[PDB]
Each structure stands twice: as C-alpha cells, then as structure tokens.
Amino acid sequence: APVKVFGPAMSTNVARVTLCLEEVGAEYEVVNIDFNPFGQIPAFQDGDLLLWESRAISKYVLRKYKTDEVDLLREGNLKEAAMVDVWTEVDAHTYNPALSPIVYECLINPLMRGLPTNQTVVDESLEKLKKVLEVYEARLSQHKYLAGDFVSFADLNHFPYTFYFMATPHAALFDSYPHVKAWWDRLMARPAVKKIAATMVP
Amino acid sequence: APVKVFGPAMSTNVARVTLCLEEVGAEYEVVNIPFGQIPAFQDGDLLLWESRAISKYVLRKYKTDEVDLLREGNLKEAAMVDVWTEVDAHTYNPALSPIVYECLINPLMRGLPTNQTVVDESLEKLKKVLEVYEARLSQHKYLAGDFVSFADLNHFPYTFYFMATPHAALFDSYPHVKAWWDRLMARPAVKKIAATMVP
C-alpha cells in the first residue's frame, strides 16, 4: 500500500517528505498541486493515519521504513539522535530564517510574479547567513555530515531551500566556506537527492 | 549522576528543559550563563544546544512506563506528538510571542513604548490559531491524544508569560483550551518550574 503525499512536488515542504521517502526506498504517490507552490505544507496518508506538517510526516516515514541499512534518525543511540535533533533545530530556527528570504526575494517573487527584489532585505539576510555559515564551516571541518560521520535527517532537512538558494545570484557565497561547499556537493551526489532535485522545477 | 543546564532560569527555553527534567524526576543542576536565551546542557561528555533537542534527549534517557512523553514505541502516537510540537514552533508561538515582547518584555526591560498595534496584529492572528486548538481539545484532553505529552509541555513557557500580559483572559473565550491549560497548570512539575520564572 503506497503512501500518499498531497501537494506540489516543487514545494520545499513537499520535497522534504519525498526526499525522505526516496532515501528509505518507499513507494509513494504524489497527488497534484494545491487547493504558494514553493512553500505549501503537505498532507499525508498512510492507511488510516492522516498527517500534516512536513517535519512530522518525514520523521514518521524515517521510523516506519527504518532498517539496519537505513537509519536516518538514530533513535536507538541517544548521543547520535541528540546530534540529529540539534542540527534539525538549527535548520528550523537559525539557518532557514536566514536563507529563505533570499530565495523569496531573488528567485520566487521575480519568477512567479515579476516582483522586484528588495536588496535591503536580501542584504540583511546575507549578513546573518554569513555568521551562520561560519558555524557550519567549523562543524563540517570535523565530520563529513552535520550529526557525525553518517547522513541523517539533519542534512536532508537542509536540502530543499538550499537547492533553490543555489539558483539565486548568491550561490557563490558557499565558496567562501569550502567544508560547507564540500558537504553540499556530497549531498548533491546522492541518488535520492538527484531524483528529488529533478522534480523541483517551476 | 546529575546533569547540568546552562542559562538563566527565567529563559523561556531553559524552562522547557527544566520542566522536562522535573517531569521525569531527574537530578540536575542549573548554572546561570532576554527571556529567550538558548540553553546549553551537559551529561557526561555529551554537550548539547537547542532546548527542543535537549528536551527530547532528557525524555528518552529517563523514560519509564509511567513517564513516556514522546510515545516513540507507537509510531502513530509519536506522529501526533510531532505534529503538535511543530504547530507550536511555527504557528502558535510566532502568533503569541510578539504579544509577550510588546506587552511585557520590551515595555519593562528595553524601555520601549508598548507598540499597541503589532499587539493587535498578533491578537487577531492568535485568535484564528486558538479556534483550531479549541476544536482539537474538544474531543481529546490533550493535543496528541488522551495522554499528556511533549506536545503539551512545549506550550507552557511562552503561554506562562502570555498569561502575565493584559490579554490573559483571551483563553476564556475558548473553554476547551482554557480547561486544557488548567490541567497543565495543575501538574506538580509545571507548578515547580513556574515558580522559577519570576524572581
């Protein structure tokens, strides 16, 4: 019984769910656009369970399909799970609020509506993001991935908005942070990530 | 062996961690390093940051059949805990916290005038959030089901400071939300932490 994801595949929050589903090898069906295509929250159905909110859906998927091969939350190991949780929360409350206004001002608003970019909002965000990337640079100088030497929910959570940031004029900023840039290219080589990236087209 | 929390007891995010420690009956120290400062935490050689990550580590480590606040052995119950934890983080708290800043934090710590127009932008926005809470808590005593969980405890710190602003009586128009808030305030762990967010 394939689970159902409701929403536009190019939404950052729908792509978070489908990336998790691809990383665990689950079969699923994506059901149509809306009723913003870049931000809309997914609904989800697995049998009689109906869920909302992409982070809760994603964690349900990573638990239900966990194997010894594929354990992206590490819940049996409290130290590892704690590090997954830490960098999941850094994404949600620190990295994404610094990066997503750049994506909206430079990519989404011009692309969807021909709206002008507000360079003052973008510039505030860039200075905030630069301080954040200094922290990621030190972390990813110690480990291949954010939670340790294994890929996890923490890394996957960074994919959808960062992918769109890479289509703005500021993508070159990551080159000032070579270990962050190395980590980004590691993620972009994963076959599940390439699969979802091909779905994220306007 | 006791664990250490780093940060001010007053902080909304330190209180999330200390409430979790009190509900599991854990032995801990608090070491004072505005109302939103992110805590650090030490257990042996494990050093953590971010109150929700620390809180979950605590609720897993000290878990018992009496105190299972994450519900991780039942994927469907854990899903509902996660849903309402996210609603708190990205919907309820962004509605509620600017009322705390512009009625309580900024007029009594930063010396700013109480911007009584972003207060009404937040109030009208909080009103439509509470409608959804009122429907949810009308067929469950708690957010994740008929059991208290991390989802409910997550709402305590900011709601405790909202309850100290002029607009505390807004909950009275949502009787199932009010009755839910009353069940949380009656817990001994909650009463004990509430006493720390004041001196």
Side-chain angles (χ1 to χ4, degrees), chain A residues 1-199:
Chain A
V3 303
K4 297 193 189 162
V5 182
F6 303 87
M10 69 178 261
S11 153
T12 52
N13 293 312
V14 172
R16 185 197 325 281
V17 166
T18 58
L19 177 53
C20 286
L21 285 157
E22 290 289 344
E23 276 284 1
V24 301
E27 305 291 314
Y28 61 94
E29 139 184 31
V30 178
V31 162
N32 84 45
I33 292 58
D34 292 319
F35 297 165
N36 195 280
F38 280 81
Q40 199 99 59
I41 317 199
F44 171 87
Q45 174 185 9
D46 176 20
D48 63 349
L49 172 70
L50 313 172
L51 296 176
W52 271 280
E53 202 280 328
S54 72
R55 285 209 190 52
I57 297 163
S58 296
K59 279 193 285 193
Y60 172 83
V61 164
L62 296 181
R63 288 166 178 148
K64 178 187 173 216
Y65 295 105
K66 183 273 186 162
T67 65
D68 287 339
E69 287 335 283
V70 188
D71 187 355
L72 290 157
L73 298 168
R74 301 288 163 122
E75 283 170 338
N77 184 315
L78 293 193
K79 290 186 81 164
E80 291 181 352
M83 301 303 315
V84 176
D85 284 359
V86 166
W87 290 95
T88 292
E89 298 293 314
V90 177
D91 172 52
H93 298 285
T94 293
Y95 176 97
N96 212 47
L99 180 129
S100 89
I102 302 175
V103 171
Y104 267 103
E105 286 300 310
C106 299
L107 174 70
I108 283 166
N109 293 351
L111 220 74
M112 284 336 264
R113 304 200 73 202
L115 283 161
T117 293
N118 189 296
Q119 282 91 1
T120 300
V121 159
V122 165
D123 266 322
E124 254 153 37
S125 298
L126 282 168
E127 301 290 307
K128 271 186 323 164
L129 181 59
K130 282 154 136 169
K131 281 167 289 132
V132 173
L133 293 177
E134 280 170 34
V135 180
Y136 280 61
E137 174 69 6
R139 177 68 174 162
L140 294 164
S141 99
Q142 330 172 270
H143 297 96
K144 288 167 47 182
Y145 303 97
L146 291 175
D149 322 292
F150 49 94
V151 68
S152 68
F153 189 43
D155 310 281
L156 306 180
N157 271 306
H158 288 75
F159 165 71
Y161 276 81
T162 303
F163 178 77
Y164 282 141
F165 179 90
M166 270 325 146
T168 78
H170 301 106
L173 175 73
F174 276 46
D175 308 343
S176 302
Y177 309 85
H179 290 90
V180 176
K181 172 62 172 162
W183 160 83
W184 175 247
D185 301 313
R186 263 185 299 270
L187 306 183
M188 280 294 342
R190 298 182 64 83
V193 174
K194 298 202 254 136
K195 185 164 193 177
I196 297 317
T199 76

Side-chain angles (χ1 to χ4, degrees), chain B residues 130-192:
Chain B
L130 291 174
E131 313 208 308
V132 176
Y133 278 62
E134 176 71 357
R136 176 65 173 167
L137 295 162
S138 81
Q139 211 67 86
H140 304 90
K141 288 327 145 183
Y142 300 94
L143 288 174
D146 291 294
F147 48 91
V148 65
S149 73
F150 185 46
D152 310 283
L153 302 174
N154 267 306
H155 292 76
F156 163 74
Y158 276 92
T159 309
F160 181 80
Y161 283 141
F162 174 89
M163 269 325 151
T165 73
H167 312 294
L170 172 68
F171 275 32
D172 282 346
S173 318
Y174 306 87
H176 296 253
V177 183
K178 225 310 191 192
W180 160 81
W181 180 246
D182 284 350
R183 298 178 264 261
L184 298 190
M185 289 292 214
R187 308 183 54 85
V190 170
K191 262 136 99 194
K192 194 181 157 199

Side-chain angles (χ1 to χ4, degrees), chain B:
Chain B
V3 291
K4 288 191 217 153
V5 182
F6 298 92
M10 218 146 266
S11 154
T12 207
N13 288 343
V14 169
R16 190 193 323 282
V17 168
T18 59
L19 172 58
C20 277
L21 288 159
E22 290 285 342
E23 294 277 4
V24 301
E27 49 299 358
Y28 66 102
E29 211 190 341
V30 167
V31 172
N32 193 150
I33 276 190
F35 299 0
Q37 165 182 179
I38 318 189
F41 169 93
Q42 173 178 20
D43 182 8
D45 62 1
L46 178 60
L47 309 178
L48 299 178
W49 270 271
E50 305 280 338
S51 61
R52 285 174 188 87
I54 299 160
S55 293
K56 275 191 289 193
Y57 174 83
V58 163
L59 295 184
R60 284 167 188 149
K61 172 176 179 202
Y62 296 95
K63 184 222 101 83
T64 78
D65 322 84
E66 205 178 347
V67 197
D68 181 10
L69 297 171
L70 294 179
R71 289 303 166 120
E72 283 176 347
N74 187 306
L75 297 200
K76 301 62 46 183
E77 295 180 351
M80 299 300 326
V81 179
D82 289 350
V83 164
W84 288 95
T85 295
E86 299 294 300
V87 171
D88 172 62
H90 297 290
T91 280
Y92 175 93
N93 222 53
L96 179 132
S97 98
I99 299 158
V100 171
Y101 281 62
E102 297 280 4
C103 290
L104 187 144
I105 284 196
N106 290 129
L108 318 167
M109 221 192 99
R110 239 295 175 198
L112 324 184
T114 166
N115 198 10
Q116 231 295 355
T117 178
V118 302
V119 164
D120 321 273
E121 187 134 286
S122 294
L123 283 165
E124 285 314 302
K125 178 166 141 34
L126 179 64
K127 260 167 91 193
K128 151 94 181 102
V129 170
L130 291 174
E131 313 208 308
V132 176
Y133 278 62
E134 176 71 357
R136 176 65 173 167
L137 295 162
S138 81
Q139 211 67 86
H140 304 90
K141 288 327 145 183
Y142 300 94
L143 288 174
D146 291 294
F147 48 91
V148 65
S149 73
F150 185 46
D152 310 283
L153 302 174
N154 267 306
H155 292 76
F156 163 74
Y158 276 92
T159 309
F160 181 80
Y161 283 141
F162 174 89
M163 269 325 151
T165 73
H167 312 294
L170 172 68
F171 275 32
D172 282 346
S173 318
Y174 306 87
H176 296 253
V177 183
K178 225 310 191 192
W180 160 81
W181 180 246
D182 284 350
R183 298 178 264 261
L184 298 190
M185 289 292 214
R187 308 183 54 85
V190 170
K191 262 136 99 194
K192 194 181 157 199
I193 295 317
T196 75
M197 300 151 63
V198 68

